[PDB]
Amino acid sequence: YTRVVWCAVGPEEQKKCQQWSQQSGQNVTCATASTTDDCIVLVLKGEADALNLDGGYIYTAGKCGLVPVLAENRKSSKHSSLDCVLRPTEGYLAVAVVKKANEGLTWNSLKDKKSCHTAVDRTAGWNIPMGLIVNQTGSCAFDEFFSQSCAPGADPKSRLCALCAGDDQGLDKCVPNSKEKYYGYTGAFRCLAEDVGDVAFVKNDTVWENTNGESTADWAKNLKREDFRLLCLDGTRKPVTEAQSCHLAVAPNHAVVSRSDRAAHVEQVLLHQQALFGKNGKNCPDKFCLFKSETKNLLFNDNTECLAKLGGRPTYEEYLGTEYVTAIANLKKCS
């Protein structure tokens, strides 16, 4: 058999990967790049095998020939007799979150406010809200809608990066990796929690996982869910318990991609590696837990219960869904 070379995005992911590689007896080894797009190029060159991706990144990777292999599956809202690996994935809820104290703000008054995004090109943080905004405004100038934003991956001198904070030293402002304080689901929700932005584009789970003591991290440890609201497309505001009826879209779960010629081998190695290090894995928590990273969602989301098999050997457009694909393509016409 061959080793699987994973691609880690930024140095925190690389440290986690190196621990996984040590635990796996080098069944998995690590390449690292500074951004997800750069990891996609490593895998296109054959210098890495796979990484797990948000759906917006699966689009980029899929246009370049990489294929979905396994998808993240989080705990299901309904009881299922099926093993996690065979349970159909449910998709996550993209939402717009604000503070309850910021009383005037609705979907219809977002113009000229301060926004917090997971990163350019990601589903809940970017493709869904900016796709909706370009369509409702009839303008491609989405870079001028919010007065200032943190949208990792954008031009660091531009208003889309003006709220980003970089690392402890203030280096790497706006880089689309975990070194940027406001990157990702947790960083964009911390950008709202600290009142750097007025609105954060994240998913429902983020709000729950980082409030009411579900996170012990310093910036989160004291946040209360009741201090947040969701913005609904009909211009109303709801408590965060109401995400099912107040979301922007349902997103396809993050999933692992690879070259087509290495998909089968990546799939077999991951199914064995989660049996060891996955949730209730043989060797988790004693030795190593593949789906933990102290809330930082490194390599996989921390709420992942398993990687699941895909039904119907789907292409990347079947996995993303025709509608989501079309919405991306419409939005990328602006660029």
Binding site: D37, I40, V41, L44, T60, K63, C64, G65, A329
Partner: peptide
């Protein structure tokens, strides 16, 4: 309806 970004 278009190609790889890289």
């Amino acid at each position: 309806l278009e190609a790889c970004a890289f």
